[PDB]
């Protein structure tokens, strides 16, 4: 057990899908995994382990923000033998050509957090995904007929940012999505020698207020999860 | 409704107790509040509103880390008329004379987050509690026979810090407890014109590994909550 | 003696009031202290020791700015046995509802100096007063019928700042007064294990640009000093 | 012409390979290009344009360091219609299992420069390559039987760094190679809307301090260049 | 009159010698100037104006630290027509071959203050003296047969520095003397369009622990004053 | 030999003039030196050694930017007994009263590079030239009847700067010329225990948009070289 995960070595697979919302974790388990067992309830951060076409897979919430997800991802790498983390989340878009419900794959993750500076002697750590995991995700998306853009995310510490102008800077430098975790997860993976990827669906445009249905959200969310799970099977080869 | 709180103006009291763990929120509601109703379930971040000796009070989890609690505290101040936030949490100690299960009141909160620098043109914002709320909490503790130390907390972004030496610096400058939120909450309160306090119990010494029972944890936790609730009644006068 | 104080152990009381202006220290001593003898003249930084209602009290100037007051407060603490320092100064106001001749108590002090960053591994140290001294000061003010505002000061390095935009930011985040020392003194008090408090009167509105009459302002200055002296008597119990 | 390139629109291909050494650009041109004409000599920064298997390709030196290569890459992008830049350089190795003559592809590039902080409001910009170009390069290397490592480079300002401790930190966080340009080039490519990639061969071990034979090292250098040229042919489809 | 100088345009000469200690200003006026007339006593920061070999010369203390001297030097320049400031102070040595009583001329001044960073968009401003004034000072020193070093000072905010290692770094980079003002005066000079020079006398050695001794303070102090005053005369011609 | 200079101890004189352009080094060797002998061609960074009025003098390009010139200047100092570096370059003007073809002497150099911050524990290092060398240069300029300004340069990392406002700040603070090297050369000089000076010729105006024109480049360029060379002679005597 660790302070935030009441479980032992072997309860988690070597690969873990992590939505922000732990309710979405329970939904992943019942919708995609066979023979699923609950492996964590500490703080209501529900975690499960089952199989997807024979492959052992886990899914657990990480919570909003770099500090929350850094706790869970670290404990998984160092205490539960986890080799790969796939964040499966939502993000807001700043580019007019990036559309609602697009799948975005974060090869890199910008941030305004200080966590990587603390790690990297106050220099610029390029918070990057594992390259094979990125390609695996792109190829799985192609096989599912989903076109996916690959590029930079921005991991914000403040959802309610007092710096509105920063969104224009993000746009100028090609940021595909604004979320709150990738740069933290990528930092942890590098620190403790594991691999990570963040995939997000665009749920918001910080531009116009445009609408989606609940049905449209479920279908797009299911597509991201399919992408992530099929990406794992490609990574196994 | 707000993106993280499915509720309307009036569902929350003007004062909100916030543990990190949403399971502890449900426990506060059933143990201390009368006539309690559920007011939030979004992302399993359970929130309740009831009364404590006639006084309308709310309790809801905020999640681990500055970014999580900044979401909820902001939305409460700006969309639900919340005037006071009391964080009710745990912390780790670095001072040998600060003992396990001590009640610590954060008049101020140091941090290694960058959130207040983003707010404060990269200068030093002294993240402080509302003074009356601090005194209210000290006086409530005295009336309950609990001695409480008042001073600085340290709100860490990394629970698993790669900078071990920083704990000695904290100790040298008198930091009473290490937690992950106060400086973020104090920042939000100042930004949006409300009041905040963080009270923590010492659950850990980053020094020796010393033990407590589950019974000892419940009693100390109940004492912190009593302190916080009685502090509100003193603040009403 | 120390490099800036030609005096000996015992020559100061264990509490020292500190205006910025040494001529103001002489003013405090002659007006409020009995049997007052001068105990320092090095660099014209006049220090005095006498009694207030039978309690031994010292008063001494600290000069303008964090670097000047850091020198004096340090030497008093480590070489002259001083346990409490009460800065008694002036500040400019930034909030419209903060009026001329309001008494302001700095529970915290923001700053643009980097002294506390030097001390605190480049993180945010929340420069705070000792809580008991704050409370003693508030109660002493209550007993004299004076309505003390407790909150954040801002300790500036540049009285003539090139960046006028920073005053709006101070206003936004609730800064009660702008002065030049508090954050420095609080850093010293935490570094060397003593206690400190800054009281200020508002002598300036960096908003409306106005006065106020000489007799009324000098009355309020005397009230601040009475609050300081009476607060130490409350601290003795 | 631009201030550092005496040539005209059309004189360069829409892809430019860029070694640091202009004499190396002449080497690339004569060895791998047919019908190669020199298109720039200003400051001795030799640029050439020819064909590789019927595809128009240019090659030109960029000089040592982020500031030098930022100038050339910018001018190519905004004035000579260049859409892709492939840096083909050398790096020093930091990881023990990264060997001499390994081909390294910088999906990302860390840095100690502050150029990207100037661009990105002092936050962390993740300096990344274009994903497709990375994949093209990996596939081209696979087709030639070469085992390319994909990950982080570190773009240093000081070849002779005063801070030897930073090399351990690079090792800890998985940096594959240390060079002087990639982060600069990736910043330019994002600023001005083009695409970039850095390939390096490991010519140095800042760990074991060793060689390796002249024929074998020049063989591996030629393989890097073949990978670069073949990757652009894959990019055309 | 200005907020810290009770005097009128004309009361000061167009060059002002400024020691930190106002009692040294007094001493200088008495010992070196004819017809010496006190032009300021606000805050005991004594200012004088008299004559040196017929040349109108002023001398006023500036207090300890960048914030103190930045106030006075500014007010002199904007409201009293002062064109040249010459700081005449003391410093601590860090180089072993710089010995006690040596005269150092601050061609530049390093600092750990944030003031120049505030002025210069967080970039490195090279805080420099006026060249002609430096040359004037060197020629006056030669003419009086006094040895004089020219180079960098370091203007510290913390006399009692908690970072002992920093002195090794100053040593490494050739710092002739540690004082508390020059970098601020040179910043003010540039900001407000005047000229300045800091000359210092090496009091103690930061390493060795021994301060200015017997009558040797006075002659060495007088040598600096002589240089400064003679340097003004050369500047006129 | 060093990694970027293929030559032996003795091949270089103890002072080296360095333009950015290696073809200017060639031109200088041809036009000003007798018995001129090429001592380096590694990376086309041409180095020469000959005679000026019997004095052994070397001249070598350093490439564009702090990182490029930091490599060469270091290697010259540590492995070829070079005592003095004189950068002889071009700069852009920011002050309207600084006109095209003006000769500027870099007494100090501001910068937006992080290199000196890396060397100086993130504090402000005042990057200065050697005083005697500055004086030598001014006296040689007077003797040749050439006007010469003495003050601060600004060493930029981005020729194509995305921060246009910064030029206003340079203007405000008296920056005589914008170039890309001086602050790095002065840092290297201090780090490795040699002396340096940067002299520049004002090519364009950053505001006005017009570069060095017709034969006036050559005479103005030759005036700088003449000053530099004559300045060496004065330094010997
Ligand atoms: O995390 C986020 N930050 C900003 N905007 C957003 N939209 C969806 C997630 C999101
Ligand atoms: O939040 C925290 N960070 C570090 N140590 C701790 N102990 C308990 C909470 C805690
Ligand atoms: O620094 C300051 N800025 C404006 N007004 C003030 N009063 C006292 C200090 C002060
Ligand atoms: O900057 C660098 N440091 C060490 N080795 C290297 N090789 C290439 C650049 C480089
Ligand atoms: O200002 C100073 N800081 C440190 N040591 C010193 N000696 C003399 C002045 C001085
Ligand atoms: O280096 C430079 N940066 C900006 N403008 C310039 N003109 C000439 C050199 C120069």
D161 phi and psi, to 5 degrees? -80, 140
Place of tokens 């005597």: F237
Pair of tokens at residue E30: 């008495």
> Atom 4 in ligand 3: which residue has the minimum CA distance?
C92
Cα distance from E193 to chain F (closest Cα, Å)?
A: 9
CA dist C79 and C9 (Å) reads: 7
Place of tokens 């008991």: C132
CA dist D76 and D69 (Å) reads: 11
Parse chain E into domains and list their residue ranges.
1-237
Number of Cβ pairs < 8 A linking chain A and chain D: 104
CA dist B177 and B154 (Å) reads: 6
Name the CA dihedral angle for B17, B20, B22, B25, rounded to a multiple of 10 degrees.
Answer: -30
CA dist E26 and E39 (Å) reads: 11
Look up residue F46 and give its DSSP letter.
-
User: Do A46 and A19 form a contact (C-beta atoms < 8 A)?
Assistant: no
- Ligand nearest B71 Cα, by number? 1
Q: Where are the beta strands (DSSP E) in D63-176?
A: 84-93, 103-111, 149-155
CA dist B131 and C149 (Å) reads: 10
Place of tokens 């490599």: F71
User: Do F19 and F89 form a contact (C-beta atoms < 8 A)?
Assistant: yes
Place of tokens 């225990």: F193
Asked if residue C212 has a cis previous peptide bond (ω within 30° of 0), the answer is yes
* Closest C-alpha to C166, from C209, C110, C237: C110
Q: Which residues contact A199 (CB under 8 A, 6 or more apart)?
A: A86, A87, A88, A89, A103, A104, A105, A106, A137, A148, A224, A227, A228
C-alpha pair distances (Å), E13 with each of B194, E52, E76: 53, 11, 10
C-alpha pair distances (Å), E72 with each of B137, E107, F208: 45, 21, 38
N-term to C-term CA, chain E: 31
Planar angle of CA D42, D45, D49, nearest 5 degrees: 100
B171 is in an annotated binding site: no
User: Do F45 and F22 form a contact (C-beta atoms < 8 A)?
Assistant: yes
CA dist E111 and C235 (Å) reads: 40
Which ligand 6 atom is nearest residue F89's CA?
A: 9
> Atom 2 in ligand 2: which residue has the minimum CA distance?
B179
Dihedral (CA of E198, E204, E206, E207) sign? positive
Cα distance from E106 to chain F (closest Cα, Å)?
A: 11
Distance (angstroms) between ligand 6 centre and the Cα of A124 equals: 26
Instruction: Give the other-Cβ count within 10 Å of A146's Cβ.
Output: 16
Look up residue F2 and give its DSSP letter.
B
**Selected residue of C124, C150, C169, C173 to mutate for chain B interface (largest B Cβ count, 10 A):** C124
Please tell me which of the candidates A63, A74, A115 has its beta carbon nearest to residue B63: A63
User: Which residues of A lie closer than 8 Å to D, measured between beta carbons?
Assistant: 107-113, 116-117, 119-121, 123-128, 131-132, 134-135, 138, 150-152, 163, 165-166, 169, 172-174, 183, 190-191, 193
C20 phi and psi, to 5 degrees? -70, -40
Pair of tokens at residue E112: 């750990």
F119 is in an annotated binding site: no
Q: Which residues contact C86 (CB under 8 A, 6 or more apart)?
A: C15, C16, C17, C18, C133, C196, C197, C198, C199, C228, C231, C232
Pair of tokens at residue A217: 């959200």
Pair of tokens at residue C25: 């220290």
Exactly one of C11, C130, C204, C223 is catalytic; which is it?
C204
CA dist B46 and B63 (Å) reads: 11
* Closest C-alpha to C26, from C45, C9, C7: C45
Whether residue F123 and residue E112 make contact (CB cut-off 8 A), yes or no, is yes
User: Do C141 and C235 form a contact (C-beta atoms < 8 A)?
Assistant: no
User: Do A143 and A96 form a contact (C-beta atoms < 8 A)?
Assistant: no
Angle between helices A131-143 and A214-236 in degrees, nearest 10: 120
Look up residue F146 and give its DSSP letter.
-
**Selected residue of E60, E65, E112 to mutate for chain C interface (largest C Cβ count, 10 A):** E65
Exactly one of B14, B204, B223, B236 is catalytic; which is it?
B204
3-state secondary structure chain A: CECCECCCCCCCCCEEEECCCHHHHHHHHHHHCEEEEEEECHHHCCEEEEEECCEEEEEECCCCCHHHHHHHHHHHHHHCCCCEEEEEEEEEECCCCCCCCCEEEEEEEEECCCHHHHHCCCCECCCECCHHHHHHHHHHHHHCCCCEEEEEEEECCCCCCCCCCHHHHHHHCCCCEEECCHHHHHHHHHHHCCEEEEEEEEEEECCCCCCCCHHHHHHHHHHHHHHHHHHHHHHHC
Whether residue F74 and residue D160 make contact (CB cut-off 8 A), yes or no, is yes
**Would the CB of A178 count as within 6 Å of ligand 1?**
yes
Angle between helices C182-191 and C66-79 in degrees, nearest 10: 30
CA dist D63 and D67 (Å) reads: 9
CA dist E31 and E34 (Å) reads: 9
Q: Which residues of E touch C191 (CB under 8 A)?
A: 162
Q: What SS3 class is residue E136?
A: helix
Instruction: Give the other-Cβ count within 10 Å of D34's Cβ.
Output: 11
Q: Which residues contact C203 (CB under 8 A, 6 or more apart)?
A: C90, C91, C92, C100, C217
User: Do A207 and A92 form a contact (C-beta atoms < 8 A)?
Assistant: no
* Closest C-alpha to E46, from E58, E57, E55, E56: E58
Using CB atoms within 10 Å of the CB of residue C51, give its burial: 0 to 12 exposed, 13 to 18 middle, 19+ buried.
middle
- Ligand nearest B68 Cα, by number? 1
Which ligand 1 atom is nearest residue A89's CA?
A: 9
Region of residue D174 (left: phi > 0; alpha: psi -120 to 50; beta: else): left
**For residue D63, what is the nearest residue in chain F, using CA coordinates?**
F63
CA dist C70 and C72 (Å) reads: 6
Radius of gyration of chain B (CA): 17
Distance (angstroms) between ligand 5 centre and the Cα of E166 equals: 14
* β partners of residue B158: none
D87 is in an annotated binding site: yes
CA dist A233 and A53 (Å) reads: 9
Helix (H) or strand (E) holding F15: strand F15-18
Q: What SS3 class is residue D212?
A: coil
CA dist B83 and B14 (Å) reads: 5
Whether residue F111 and residue E121 make contact (CB cut-off 8 A), yes or no, is no
Whether residue E70 and residue C21 make contact (CB cut-off 8 A), yes or no, is no
D90 is in an annotated binding site: yes
* Closest C-alpha to B19, from B7, B8, B27: B27
**For residue C21, what is the nearest residue in chain E, using CA coordinates?**
E43
User: Do B162 and A118 form a contact (C-beta atoms < 8 A)?
Assistant: yes
Radius of gyration of chain D (CA): 17
Cα distance from B40 to chain A (closest Cα, Å)?
A: 14
Which ranges of E80-211 would DSSP assign to H, the alpha helix?
A: 115-119, 131-143, 165-172, 182-192
Angle between helices B131-143 and B214-236 in degrees, nearest 10: 120
Q: Which chains touch A (3 or more CB pairs under 8 A)?
A: B, D
Planar angle of CA D146, D150, D154, nearest 5 degrees: 125
Whether residue C157 and residue E20 make contact (CB cut-off 8 A), yes or no, is no
Pair of tokens at residue B223: 């004492």
* β partners of residue F48: F38, F59
Q: What SS3 class is residue D151?
A: strand
Whether residue A107 and residue D107 make contact (CB cut-off 8 A), yes or no, is yes
Which ligand 5 atom is nearest residue E180's CA?
A: 1
User: Do C177 and C106 form a contact (C-beta atoms < 8 A)?
Assistant: yes
- For a mutational test of ligand 3's pocket, the pick from C106, C156, C158, i.e. the residue with the most ligand atoms closer than 8 A to its C-beta, is C156
CA dist B49 and B58 (Å) reads: 4
Please tell me which of the candidates D107, D112, D172 has its beta carbon nearest to residue A128: D107
Pair of tokens at residue A119: 């790690």
Radius of gyration of chain A (CA): 17
N-term to C-term CA, chain B: 32
Which ligand 2 atom is nearest residue B89's CA?
A: 9
b/e string for B52-63 if b means 16 or more Cβ within 10 A?
beeeebbbbbbb
CA dist F236 and F83 (Å) reads: 12
**F and B touch per CB criterion (3+ pairs under 8 A):** no
B31 phi and psi, to 5 degrees? -85, -35
Look up residue F22 and give its DSSP letter.
H
Place of tokens 């510290």: E156
Q: Strand D177-179 to strand C47-52: parallel, antiparallel, or no bridges (unpaired)? A: unpaired
E174 phi and psi, to 5 degrees? 85, 25
Pair of tokens at residue D193: 């809307």
CA dist C75 and D82 (Å) reads: 65
C-alpha pair distances (Å), C2 with each of C73, C76, E209: 12, 9, 13
Q: Give the 3-state secondary structure percentages of chain D, helix then strand then coil, rounded to 5.
A: 35, 30, 35
- For a mutational test of ligand 6's pocket, the pick from F20, F68, F89, F91, i.e. the residue with the most ligand atoms closer than 8 A to its C-beta, is F91
Cα distance from E209 to chain F (closest Cα, Å)?
A: 24
User: Do B182 and B198 form a contact (C-beta atoms < 8 A)?
Assistant: yes
Distance (angstroms) between ligand 2 centre and the Cα of B179 equals: 5
Q: Which residues of E touch C71 (CB under 8 A)?
A: 64, 159-160
Helix (H) or strand (E) holding D30: helix D22-32
Q: Which residues contact B184 (CB under 8 A, 6 or more apart)?
A: B65, B66, B67, B69, B70, B73, B111, B113, B115, B155
CA dist D171 and D168 (Å) reads: 5
* Closest C-alpha to F235, from F117, F118, F83, F108: F83
Q: Which residues contact F205 (CB under 8 A, 6 or more apart)?
A: F92, F93, F94, F96, F100
Place of tokens 């409306």: C208
CA dist D48 and D69 (Å) reads: 16
CATH 3.50.50.60 for domain F1-237, yes or no, is no
CA dist E38 and E59 (Å) reads: 9
Helix (H) or strand (E) holding E50: strand E47-52
User: Do D84 and D196 form a contact (C-beta atoms < 8 A)?
Assistant: yes
Pair of tokens at residue D201: 């061969």
User: Do D55 and D78 form a contact (C-beta atoms < 8 A)?
Assistant: no
Q: What SS3 class is residue D210?
A: coil
CA dist E2 and A173 (Å) reads: 49
Asked if residue E150 has a cis previous peptide bond (ω within 30° of 0), the answer is no
Report long-range pairs for F41-46 (Cβ below 8 Å, ≥24 apart): F41/F6, F42/F4, F42/F5, F42/F6, F43/D20, F43/D21, F43/D22, F43/D23, F43/D64, F43/F4, F44/D21, F44/D22, F44/D23, F44/D44, F44/D46, F44/D61, F45/D44, F45/F4, F45/F72, F46/D44, F46/F22
Please tell me which of the candidates E119, E123, E128 has its beta carbon nearest to residue F126: E128
* Closest C-alpha to A117, from E223, B205, D228, B117: B117
Whether residue D44 and residue F64 make contact (CB cut-off 8 A), yes or no, is no
b/e string for D113-148 if b means 16 or more Cβ within 10 A?
bbbbbbbbeebbbbbbbbbbbbbbbbbbbeeeebeb
* β partners of residue C49: C37, C58
CA dist D141 and C88 (Å) reads: 73
CA dist B150 and C134 (Å) reads: 12
Using CB atoms within 10 Å of the CB of residue C111, give its burial: 0 to 12 exposed, 13 to 18 middle, 19+ buried.
buried
Q: How far is CA D219 from the centre of its chain?
A: 18
**For residue D61, what is the nearest residue in chain F, using CA coordinates?**
F43
Q: Which chains touch C (3 or more CB pairs under 8 A)?
A: B, E
CA dist E173 and E77 (Å) reads: 32
The resolution in angstroms reads 2.5
Q: Which residues contact E188 (CB under 8 A, 6 or more apart)?
A: E69, E70, E73, E74, E77, E194, E196
- In DSSP notation, chain C reads -BTTB---TTSS-SEEEE-S-HHHHHHHHHHH-EEEEEEE-GGG--EEEEEETTEEEEEE---SSHHHHHHHHHHHHHHS---EEEEEEEEEE-STTS-TT-EEEEEEEEES-SHHHHHTTTSB---B--HHHHHHHHHHHHHTT---EEEEEEE-S-SS-S-TTHHHHHHHTT--EEESSHHHHHHHHHHTT-EEEEEEEEEEETTT-----HHHHHHHHHHHHHHHHHHHHHHH-
Instruction: Give the other-Cβ count within 10 Å of E41's Cβ.
Output: 15
Instruction: Give the other-Cβ count within 10 Å of D16's Cβ.
Output: 28
Look up residue F18 and give its DSSP letter.
E
Dihedral (CA of D116, D119, D121, D127) sign? negative
**Selected residue of D110, D113, D124 to mutate for chain A interface (largest A Cβ count, 10 A):** D124
User: Do E108 and E185 form a contact (C-beta atoms < 8 A)?
Assistant: no
> Atom 6 in ligand 2: which residue has the minimum CA distance?
B92
- Ligand nearest B206 Cα, by number? 2
Instruction: Give the other-Cβ count within 10 Å of C207's Cβ.
Output: 14
In this structure, chain A runs to a length of 237
E202 phi and psi, to 5 degrees? -75, 105
* Closest C-alpha to E94, from E15, E211, E173, E181: E173
User: Do B152 and B109 form a contact (C-beta atoms < 8 A)?
Assistant: yes
Q: Which residues of B touch C191 (CB under 8 A)?
A: 172-173
Pair of tokens at residue D32: 């791998």
**E and C touch per CB criterion (3+ pairs under 8 A):** yes
């Amino acid at each position: 057990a660790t302070p935030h995960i009441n479980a032992e070595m072997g309860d988690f697979a070597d690969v873990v899908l992590m939505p922000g919302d732990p309710l979405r974790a329970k939904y992943i388990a019942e919708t995609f995994l066979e023979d699923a067992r609950e492996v964590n309830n500490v703080r209501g951060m529900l975690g499960f382990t089952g199989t997807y076409k024979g492959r052992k897979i886990s899914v657990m919430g990480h919570g909003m923000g770099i500090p929350s997800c850094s706790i869970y991802t670290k404990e998984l790498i160092t205490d539960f033998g986890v080799k790969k983390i796939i964040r499966v989340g939502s993000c807001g878009a700043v580019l007019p050509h990036v559309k609602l419900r697009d799948v975005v794959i974060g090869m890199g993750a910008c941030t305004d957090s200080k966590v990587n500076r603390i790690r990297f002697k106050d220099h610029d750590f390029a918070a990057i995904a594992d390259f094979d995991m990125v390609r695996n995700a792109v190829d799985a998306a192609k096989a599912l007929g989903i076109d996916a853009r690959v590029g930079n995310l921005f991991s914000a510490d403040l959802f309610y940012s007092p710096d509105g102008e920063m969104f224009d800077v993000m746009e100028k430098y090609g940021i595909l999505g604004v979320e709150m975790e990738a740069a933290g997860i990528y930092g942890v993976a590098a620190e403790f020698g594991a691999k990570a990827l963040t995939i997000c669906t665009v749920s918001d445009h910080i531009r116009t207020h445009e609408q989606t249905t609940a049905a449209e959200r479920q279908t797009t969310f299911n597509d991201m999860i399919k992408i992530a799970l099929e990406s794992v099977l490609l990574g196994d080869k």
